[PDB]
Amino acid sequence: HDSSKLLWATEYIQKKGKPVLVNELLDYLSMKKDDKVIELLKKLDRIEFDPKKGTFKYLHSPSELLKLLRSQVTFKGISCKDLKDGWPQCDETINQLEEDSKILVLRTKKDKTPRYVWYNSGGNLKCIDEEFVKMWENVQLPQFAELPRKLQDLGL
Amino acid sequence: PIDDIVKNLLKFVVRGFYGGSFVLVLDAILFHSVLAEDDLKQLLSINKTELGPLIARLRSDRLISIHKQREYPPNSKSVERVYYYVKYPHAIDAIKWKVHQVVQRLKDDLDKNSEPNGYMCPICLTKYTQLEAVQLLNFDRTEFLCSLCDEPLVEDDSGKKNKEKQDKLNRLMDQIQPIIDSLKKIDDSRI
Numbered sequence: 001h002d003s004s005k006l007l008w009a010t011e012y013i014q015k016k017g018k019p020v021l022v023n024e025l026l027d028y029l030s031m032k033k034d035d036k037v038i039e040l041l042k043k044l045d046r047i048e049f050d051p052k053k054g055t056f057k058y059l060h061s062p063s064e065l066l067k068l069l070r071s072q073v074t075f076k077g078i079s080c081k082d083l084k085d086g087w088p089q090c091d092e093t094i095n096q097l098e099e100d101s102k103i104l105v106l107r108t109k110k111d112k113t114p115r116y117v118w119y120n121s122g123g124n125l126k127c128i129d130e131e132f133v134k135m136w137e138n139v140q141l142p143q144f145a146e147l148p149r150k151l152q153d154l155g156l
Numbered sequence: 157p158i159d160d161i162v163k164n165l166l167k168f169v170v171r172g173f174y175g176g177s178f179v180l181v182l183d184a185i186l187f188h189s190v191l192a193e194d195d196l197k198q199l200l201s202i203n204k205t206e207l208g209p210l211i212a213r214l215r216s217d218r219l220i221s222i223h224k225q226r227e228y229p230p231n232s233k234s235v236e237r238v239y240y241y242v243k244y245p246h247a248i249d250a251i252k253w254k255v256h257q258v259v260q261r262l263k264d265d266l267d268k269n270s271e272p273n274g275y276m277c278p279i280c281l282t283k284y285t286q287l288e289a290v291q292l293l294n295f296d297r298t299e300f301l302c303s304l305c306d307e308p309l310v311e312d313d314s315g316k317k318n319k320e321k322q323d324k325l326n327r328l329m330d331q332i333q334p335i336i337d338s339l340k341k342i343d344d345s346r347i
């Protein structure tokens with residue numbers, strides 16, 4: 001197919017992840033040997049095609065992830081799949097760049113912690129003791145503007 | 157502006173006293189004044205099973221409240237906009253009340269375990285004291301036997317717990333200082 005073979009090459013190109021010879025790539029899968037896959041690759045951003053020698057890349061750094069997190073303010077949500085093909089082991093980078101340096105959405109630690117784009121200042125704020133969270137949650141937040149009334153009584 | 161410190165303190169308490177997905181949604185809500193839930197859903201890119209409770213906590217914390225903002229759809233139907241409206245005065249006042257209830261409780265804990273006096277029996281495990289037992293001292297004895305087991309007693313209490321409570325108030329004040337920094341800073345204009 002025109003869509004299956006070119007997609008097969010792009011994943012094959014994606015799997016390589018390095019600038020390979022235009023001859024090394026075409027024989028890599030033995031499927032994208034027609035000009036349609038290359039033309040689709042050149043017409044699209046799936047495979048980076050340039051007038052120079054055979055170089056296959058995307059159209060990627062912990063610093064850039066900060067830029068990426070900054071660029072995802074007031075915007076949609078992106079998975080870490082482009083962050084996992086995208087500076088491999090960004091989970092290491094997220095844990096190392098903790099405290100908002102590489103924020104994460106850790107739904108659970110069994111799916112490579114599939115996270116999203118998150119922007120924060122403190123990010124981690126693990127200084128707050130766990131019991132303090134309990135005794136924080138131990139307190140139930142009250143009703144309407146008597147809450148300003150109670151605290152003026154307390155002087156807050 | 158005073159609102160950013162209101163926002164910054166909110167992100168502080170909710171990153172410290174709540175999870176990260178809480179601050180992800182709060183920023184998401186803070187990303188747009190009138191934010192559709194659908195855009196919020198795609199930003200999180202997670203199931204509704206992981207979006208609602210975080211919004212519920214923000215509603216419970218009164219940091220952000222649900223506003224029935226008039227949305228007139230173009231499909232000849234009636235669709236509301238699920239756009240969160242941040243209730244800042246009720247956000248900070250509630251946080252203060254939590255702060256006030258958390259500090260006095262742990263303050264009360266400090267006074268709970270301060271002073272040792274009284275015995276026990278360690279055989280039948282019944283508590284004792286100076287006085288009831290000195291009633292029980294015998295002229296031929298130096299130590300207080302037990303009424304029950306006829307078997308001498310031991311002392312019991314430990315002020316260690318008061319020290320344990322002293323550290324907790326120390327720990328809570330260290331945790332609460334940036335919170336009460338922002339609150340008083342917010343308290344200038346009541347915003």
Ligand SMILES: [Zn+2]
Pocket residue numbers: 277278279280281282302303304305306307
């Ligand atoms: Zn006894």
